[PDB]
Write a protein that binds this ligand. Structure first.
Ligand code: ATP
Ligand code: ATP
Ligand code: ATP
Ligand code: ATP
Ligand code: CTP
Ligand code: ZN
Lengths: 715, 686
């Protein structure tokens, strides 16, 4: 009799005095009594509010009021969601708004790209309101903690993994027997697991995996040559080859001519296969919202002829380019350095190294990874045991490092990352800028940071608990072959007992402003700021270790590469607290543990100031170095940076320059008219946080100002 | 000063005492009975010309409360709005829960080629769920909304409505190869074909088709042969210059026994070229069936040169052997064009390839048959002498689509496609007129209802076309730069109004069999009045389509809609509304367009005779289906008989199937609920 729940969830009484008020309101002006209203009230008096409305309609119809009743309800039910309509119209019309450029690699104009924005915008509120806890929600609402790749939470999707590419090639999913077959199987495997993850893929040992097939190609070539001209060349199968070099046939005869011909035709096929592989991972737009698969490759630690044959071919292909002398945006290539193998002039591969340098002085790649840097070393590494690639460090895309373990064996193959979240420190500092006692200021800062860290750890543990319940069959390829503990679980079982072999990351942003917006100067010009910065980082590392010991997981600190986050906190902070000089007068925040870009400094000082942090940030780091356009010709400068890196303890590097873009990619400082193409279109090619990004139109609206303020360390 | 905008849209004014009550309610729980001391000043400060809004007041009061070092008051003042907005929603929470839990619900299974147990599938499902309600308002019209609500008109691809996307196109794979977006070897062309298909898939939401495989891939075998002979000459010093423009009857490989001098140096090159082509085709077929897989089709069969014959032989052999350890391939779609005098008679030149195709279509059923010159596929400008050209011969696209006729252009099927097609239900219109005992009145009422609904559907299609007209050039990068007919001289920031007019619009029909099983008489099988009634209905629909085309200045074509997922949709609503009817709404699915029900046993000749006259009227699409028993595998004579029967009558398409994989999809686990019963109720036409 009395059960009325007005929409929402409130439980209220049946007043019975407004059901007449509303009907009277609907008849104020419709041309067309009190008795009829009383009869309707009596009839209805004989529940869910919404439903009953329909009955009311008929009571009005059987008597100019029904049309005046549903119309108003629909006209008010539509104005309640006039905020989503604006964003939907913005997406449909494909305008350059802040909500369509959060990722500079996608293309939102195409229907495929346009179909991802709706899913992201519809799935963010769901995870916000129905999955997270209350403390985490309140922390996130106030712009303190950030969750990365939030709009994948319900899918239970991991981030990155290193591919073991020996089971796939050997057993297939038929076995390969030529160079091209393996070269295509690699691409197939890479694109069939960037559909079960939201991060990137890396291949740690290119040479050690693709070497044993050049021998098979040579054997097939010799067999064909013997078939043509009847002879017995059986002995010339296991012939020790020092190098797979090519020479013109300018005068020779007998079996030597046949052997030289076989070598030449085995080299050409490898060159073709490598070129095809490069061209395959740069145009097949097949990864999701109209993207290219995020792929990286490792090499530089092999001595056999085949390995040194593959490296030379891939480097030559990269130098040559794709198209009319253009530059390939993918894959990411990183060179591995180790004294006694590559660096010293007496070592076996020092001639391929003095080249990586020449290529990197032209095409932005490869980068350099410093092995045995006092934390990348290992104890089970024998130089005479097939140059073990298992006991070596490999780096995934966007400054990610996974090398340490606590309940297994120290390796980097068949393991990856599960999630990582970021903590804002600028707001904590600015919240305590009204005190004069420095000791109390620092103590309050530390207390607040301690408070935030526990919430972050709880959030990571909650996400891990949610991911633990995923089924095996949701990841067919990534849970049968490519993982450190697969091959012993059915497709109708959980992955609870094979998931703990992973890493969790805690990051930070703006250490060049947070701890130094409270003091006179930053860590690039004041000697005393370095001590405070190192104290903060050490405190964070100690708390991370304590959390690892507590929750039974693997926590690590990381320098978050900010792409869409470079201008997200700044706007809200400026709106709330206003404008403070040298803190929030830039529209962007300097990346983690990095000197401000707009501060002029030489390479030596920058390296010395950014060196000690790399030991603490044991989840990822980087050391950028700009170079002017006229010093991009000499491949001598990329050798300073590397020896400077080696002198101190650093584990990652790169070099960047400006590049204007028929496709005449001239590197001069400024260009007016292209030499060949008369079109005025002249774009710029550079990197944002670890990958090159097209032209200066598909960028974020907040990180573009950073590109206009970079300074050119000359070397 | 007394005006505040509100969520509901009413503006009016504020008494300003409501805020005090709200704060009191907030504070009456935290065990902190604050008096009006703070409330007086907070109200005075927050009160200070219609400039305020309900959202702004919320933020202002929250900040002021936080500044009082209370927080908890704010904590449960903001924890009440959120628990209310949740109750104002979550009526669509069960669907999301089912999707997340990965259960076998009807929502998950709509397309059998998509995987719902992967992040990409879940993302697409969320996008579809959040975009379907949007189109129902702010885009359609009131009359169209009423029509669609009452289960009359079905709009295909309604998820992609706001994206302004077309459906399908025929690839002119010659400009792409000659001028790269230039191949010099067979492998490069094989890779570029797949790259083009994959990149063009995203810009549309339908299948892709290659209209002439041989005429495009032939000119590269000769270059491969030239390279091989040049390499062999480099090996052993000889001239070998003359042996470049040497005609070859056919590339056949034989053992190198008892050969010497300049005769062993040509058979070897031929063998190498054959192996190269075989490997390239095997790579193509293996790559287009395991790359996450673009519904693709390829057409071939009307070439007479040596290179085309080699390509066809190699691809047929690769298909016969199979991909993997003897597992039948699923994609791509292979169709064999039949021409009388070039590919059919024993005296013709491609008879052996025809027999090989008939032998492959018994164990690896997939090579279909397209009958050219079937009284409507003839073209007046097709002659085989100079190039034996291909731009004036029909080319299918799979999914029963057929785009061949235009009224403001050339009669071709290259670089043209279908824009959108809707479906009209004709079973409910008959179930609602099953009470009148006077037959003539029943027929007249049915025709009137059909006229009205058809006019509504035409208006809806025109509105969708008008919406799509405004799309811009940069919407589709590759499609509108090298592919779509006249679209080669338009700026990246210009409309596509000039080129879009060459597409086609399709009006589909479904359930012609059940429409008269008991509605207006007897079954479409053992009866003679059913044929006349069906012919009258289809002719009326065709005339209406023609007058619509003359009126709105567009292209309209009748269509036999494929069962995308519309096999258990209408039947459920009909069963719920009108209840159970013997022999009408008891099979939980409707037989496809102008077909004979599968559960009705009959021979091939009967089906051919019954379904022959309908094809001439369905100029937008049609299909012929035959089933056979296991034995069929080891006897290609049955396929020859079926094809001869098709040629004797007037038809334009065909296929054969043997009754786990079955017509293509994998194991019978990703099917829709409705089609499983249909599969379980299939018979065999020996
Ligand atoms: N407290 C109530 N007790 C009984 N009937 C009510 C009550 N409030 C509203 N009704 C009846 O229910 C109808 C629902 O109208 P209304 O749209 O206001 O619903 P609601 O759920 O209260 O939401 P809202 O006020 O936000 O629109 C009112 O027109 C009136 O007929
Ligand atoms: N001026 C009006 N003209 C037409 N219909 C009206 C009018 N005012 C209210 N209604 C009808 O009354 C209902 C809306 O009621 P209203 O928005 O006044 O909330 P309410 O029921 O009084 O709220 P609550 O119970 O939450 O206090 C809908 O049925 C709407 O059609
Ligand atoms: N009529 C009013 N005029 C001015 N301020 C108001 C009025 N009603 C409420 N407020 C205050 O402004 C806030 C507006 O937020 P709120 O979401 O409650 O608005 P609303 O439109 O009244 O909500 P709902 O329709 O969901 O009941 C209220 O929390 C209260 O603090
Ligand atoms: N029990 C409660 N505890 C805490 N806050 C509450 C409680 N009930 C309501 N509020 C707060 O009061 C406001 C909700 O008010 P409500 O929607 O009932 O209408 P109102 O503010 O009186 O205005 P209107 O005249 O539009 O109905 C929100 O600020 C909500 O946070
Ligand atoms: N095409 C891309 C781009 C980057 N990454 C991943 O996306 C993250 C982006 O870094 P970050 O800026 O910290 O996160 P967001 O701000 O959310 O980046 P975005 O908005 O572009 O997603 C990186 O860790 C990288 O692994 C990726 O998998 N796919
Ligand atoms: Zn140019």
């Amino acid at each position: 009799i009395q059960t009325v729940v007005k929409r929402d969830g409130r439980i209220v009484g049946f007043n019975e005095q407004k059901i007449m008020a509303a009907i009277r309101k609907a008849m104020l002006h419709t041309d067309k009594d009190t008795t009829l209203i009383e009869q309707i009230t009596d009839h209805i008096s004989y529940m869910s509010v919404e439903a009953i409305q329909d009955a009311i309609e008929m009571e009005l119809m059987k008597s100019d009021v029904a049309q005046k009743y549903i119309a108003y309800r629909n006209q008010r039910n539509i104005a309640r969601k006039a905020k989503t309509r604006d964003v939907f119209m913005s997406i449909v019309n494909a305008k350059n708004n802040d909500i369509t450029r959060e990722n500079a690699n996608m293309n939102a104009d195409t229907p495929a790209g346009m179909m991802m924005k709706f899913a992201s915008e519809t799935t963010k509120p769901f995870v916000d309101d129905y999955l997270l806890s209350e403390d985490v929600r309140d922390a996130v609402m106030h712009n303190y903690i950030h969750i990365h790749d939030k709009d994948y939470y319900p899918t239970k999707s991991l981030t990155c993994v290193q591919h073991p590419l020996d089971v796939i090639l050997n057993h297939g999913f038929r076995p390969a027997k030529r160079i091209e077959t393996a070269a295509v199987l690699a691409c197939i495997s890479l694109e069939t697991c960037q559909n079960e993850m939201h991060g990137g893929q890396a291949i740690p040992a290119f040479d050690f995996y693709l070497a044993p097939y050049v021998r098979m190609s040579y054997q097939e070539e010799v067999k064909n040559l013997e078939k043509l001209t009847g002879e017995d060349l059986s002995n010339l199968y296991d012939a020790p080859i020092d190098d797979y070099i090519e020479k013109p046939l300018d005068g020779l005869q007998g079996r030597e001519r046949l052997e030289q011909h076989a070598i030449n035709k085995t080299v050409n096929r490898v060159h073709q296969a490598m070129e095809a592989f490069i061209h395959n991972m740069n145009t097949i737009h097949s990864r999701g919202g109209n993207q290219v698969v995020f792929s990286s490759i490792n090499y530089g630690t092999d001595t056999s002829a085949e390995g040194r044959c593959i490296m030379r071919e891939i480097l030559q292909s990269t130098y040559q380019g794709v198209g009319n002398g253009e530059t390939a945006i993918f894959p990411i290539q990183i060179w591995k350095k180790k004294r006694g193998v590559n660096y010293l002039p007496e070592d076996r591969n020092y001639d391929l190294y003095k080249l990586a340098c020449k290529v990197t002085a032209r095409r932005f790649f490869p980068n350099f990874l410093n092995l045995d840097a006092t934390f990348n070393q290992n104890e089970k590494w024998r130089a005479d045991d097939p140059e073990r690639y298992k006991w070596e460090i490999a780096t995934m895309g966007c400054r990610t490092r996974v090398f340490e373990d606590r309940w297994g064996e120290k390796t980097s193959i068949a393991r990856g990352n599960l999630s990582f979240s970021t903590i804002n420190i600028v707001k904590l500092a600015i919240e305590c800028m009204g005190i004069e006692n420095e000791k109390q200021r620092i103590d309050m800062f530390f207390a607040k940071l301690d408070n935030i860290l526990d919430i972050t750890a709880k959030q990571l543990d909650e996400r891990f608990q949610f991911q633990k319940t995923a089924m095996a069959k949701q990841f067919p390829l990534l849970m049968k072959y490519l993982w450190v503990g697969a091959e012993n679980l059915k497709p109708e079982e959980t992955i609870e007992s094979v998931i703990n072999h992973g890493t969790l990351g805690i990051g930070f942003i703006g250490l060049a402003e947070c701890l130094v917006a409270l003091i006179g100067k930053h860590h690039g010009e004041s000697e005393k700021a370095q001590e405070l910065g190192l104290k903060i980082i050490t405190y964070m590392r100690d708390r991370a270790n304590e959390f690892s010991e507590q929750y039974h997981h693997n926590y690590s600190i990381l320098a978050t590469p900010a792409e869409g986050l470079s201008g997200k906190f700044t706007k809200k902070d400026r709106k709330q607290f206003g404008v403070i000089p040298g803190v929030t007068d830039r529209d962007y925040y300097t990346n983690s543990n990095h000197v401000p870009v707009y501060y002029k400094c030489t390479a030596l000082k920058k390296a010395q100031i950014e060196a000690p942090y790399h030991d603490l940030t044991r989840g990822g780091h980087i050391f950028y170095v700009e170079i002017d356009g006229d010093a991009t010709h000499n491949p001598s400068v990329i050798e300073s940076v590397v020896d400077m890196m080696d002198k101190y303890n650093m584990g990652y590097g790169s070099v960047n320059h400006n590049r204007n873009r028929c496709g005449y990619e001239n590197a001069d400082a400024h260009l007016e008219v292209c030499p060949k193409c008369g079109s005025h279109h002249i774009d710029k090619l550079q990197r944002i946080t670890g990958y090159l990004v097209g032209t200066t139109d598909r960028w974020n609206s907040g990180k573009l100002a950073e590109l206009h303020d970079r300074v050119t360390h000359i070397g």
